[PDB]
Design a protein around this ligand. Structure first.
Ligand SMILES: [Br-]
Ligand SMILES: [Br-]
Ligand SMILES: [Br-]
Ligand SMILES: [Br-]
Ligand SMILES: [Br-]
Ligand SMILES: [Br-]
Ligand SMILES: [Br-]
Ligand SMILES: [Br-]
Ligand SMILES: [Br-]
Ligand SMILES: [Br-]
Ligand SMILES: [Br-]
Ligand SMILES: [Br-]
Ligand SMILES: [Br-]
Length: 491
């Protein structure tokens, strides 16, 4: 429930890992000649960045996993129909369908385990850095509850990355890294602390916490990683059992040639082609491909209660039963059954900055709250002069106040702040998909072309795939038609 400083919403959501081979985000290596304070800040920043990345892609996209089931059913049914039309044996029909599931599951699982492996490899690289600098304690980077490294040998890591073989459905083996951590004491000591886990299971936990705590940030949470793992197992079990029930009831009665899907462009295929040539943001194209109810016809101007930030953009609900999002109404996403996704241009982000001191003493402007990353505070003085200050230029006083010296920017250095507002630092139109976590109010709902002001929202999605549906050509024709006109609406 933590994202862009300006919006409680989890930002930079990447759902592409459920539809394509996803490349992991690499580790940042700090310099040799560094100060303990600088190393601690750089390590804390890397942990925050890694957790934020993992939240947006794997960890916080739980309610879109029913879409993975939909994608897996589409792909397997097409493979099965081709075999049924060829007058093949029931085993050959199921073989083609399950080979499609095997390749799809391998991709989804490999992407998921690859991101865990990178998180765990990064921690080791960060641990090795702390060991080498010798000005920072291991208790800073590896804290599992009892970070007492008094009996651990010099130049030795308390971590061990164990190779664990995962049997991928396509017959191949994948090396999943099992994270083991031992503080160094003997079994018998009261201080003895050991943890060993991965997204699949907790091997051993002694005087330990699965998750790591670095500068107050809890990450590598087994409960978070295992939640996605157990849901992934559920989804692919349901597809395989469902396709078995489907073929058993469809074999013989559905005539060979009744359904012709050989040239069909699947919602998954449609979204992957968007990557080659992008006419819209990838995440909304992916959410459409996963059959998540979206509102393409309207444009909502939202305002965040706590922040004051206003944004125009398009909505997406994982559960359409979360009711219509009416204009003039205030909504708290913590109460909702599903997850709210908002796709909007970050450059347009704007809101009032009331947390500012009146006095401009010797050109110095002081603010009473942390400036938001990727935004600039536009300070207007009583002499009708304005100065744009990006967050990175605000110096922390450690008093809960931040200051900037505008002696080179203002004509009158000694003055009073008239008003202040925060605006985005983005040079161009930059689209982003956020998962709204904090309370928001829907200001206005603008129709897509005409510009009319509507009261409520209307979400649309194609027929969800079951173990007994997509028997008629009409069901399949509607799938391609409904999807291609949704993509057109965002272009
Ligand atoms: Br330094
Ligand atoms: Br597909
Ligand atoms: Br066919
Ligand atoms: Br890997
Ligand atoms: Br330390
Ligand atoms: Br120690
Ligand atoms: Br050990
Ligand atoms: Br000991
Ligand atoms: Br994480
Ligand atoms: Br946990
Ligand atoms: Br048949
Ligand atoms: Br819907
Ligand atoms: Br669905």
């Amino acid at each position: 429930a933590i994202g862009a400083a300006a919006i409680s919403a989890v930002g930079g959501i990447g759902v592409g890992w459920t539809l394509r081979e996803f490349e992991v985000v690499g580790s940042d290596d700090p310099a040799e000649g560094l100060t303990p304070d600088v190393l601690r800040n750089q390590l804390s920043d890397s942990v925050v960045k890694r957790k934020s990345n993992n939240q947006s892609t794997m960890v916080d996209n739980q309610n879109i996993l029913d879409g993975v089931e939909h994608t897996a059913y589409t792909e397997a049914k097409i493979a099965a129909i081709e075999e049924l039309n060829a007058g093949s044996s029931e085993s050959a029909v199921l073989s083609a369908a399950n080979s499609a599931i095997d390749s799809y599951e391998t991709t989804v699982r490999t992407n998921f385990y690859k991101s865990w492996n990178e998180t765990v490899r990064e921690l080791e690289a960060m641990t090795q850095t702390v060991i080498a600098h010798a000005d920072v304690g291991l208790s800073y980077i590896t804290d599992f509850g009892d970070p007492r490294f008094g009996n651990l040998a010099s130049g030795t890591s308390p971590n061990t990355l164990k190779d664990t073989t995962v049997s991928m459905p396509d017959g191949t083996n994948f090396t999943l890294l099992t994270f083991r951590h031992n503080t160094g004491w003997d079994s018998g000591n009261a201080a003895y602390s050991v943890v060993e886990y991965n997204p699949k299971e907790v091997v051993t936990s002694t005087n330990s916490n699965t998750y790591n705590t670095v500068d107050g940030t809890q990450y590598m949470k087994f409960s978070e990683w295992n939640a996605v793992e157990t849901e992934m197992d559920t989804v692919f079990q349901n597809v395989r059992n469902g396709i078995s029930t489907w073929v058993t009831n469809v074999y013989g009665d559905v005539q060979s040639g009744a359904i012709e899907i050989s040239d069909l462009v699947t919602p998954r295929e449609r979204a992957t082609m968007m990557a080659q040539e992008e006419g819209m943001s990838q995440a909304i194209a992916d959410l459409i491909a996963l059959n998540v109810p979206v509102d393409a016809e309207r444009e909502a101007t939202i305002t965040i209660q706590d922040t004051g930030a206003t944004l125009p953009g398009t909505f997406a609900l994982t559960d359409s039963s979360d009711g219509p999002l009416s204009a003039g109404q205030t909504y708290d996403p913590s109460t909702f059954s599903g997850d709210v996704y908002f796709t909007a241009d970050m450059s347009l982000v704007e809101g009032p900055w009331d947390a500012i001191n009146s006095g401009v003493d010797g050109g110095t402007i002081t603010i009473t709250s942390e400036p938001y990353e990727g935004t600039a505070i536009e300070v207007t003085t009583v002499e009708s002069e304005t100065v744009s200050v990006p967050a990175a230029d605000w110096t922390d006083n450690g008093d809960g106040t931040w200051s900037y010296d505008a002696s080179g920017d203002l004509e009158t250095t000694i003055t009073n702040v008239d008003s202040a507002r925060f605006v985005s630092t983005a040079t161009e139109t930059t689209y982003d998909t956020l998962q709204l976590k904090g309370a928001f109010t829907v200001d206005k709902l603008v129709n897509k072309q005409s510009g009319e002001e509507v009261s409520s929202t209307s979400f649309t999605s194609s027929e969800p795939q079951t173990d007994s549906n997509y028997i008629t050509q009409d069901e399949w024709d509607q799938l391609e038609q409904q999807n291609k006109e949704l993509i057109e609406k965002y272009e």
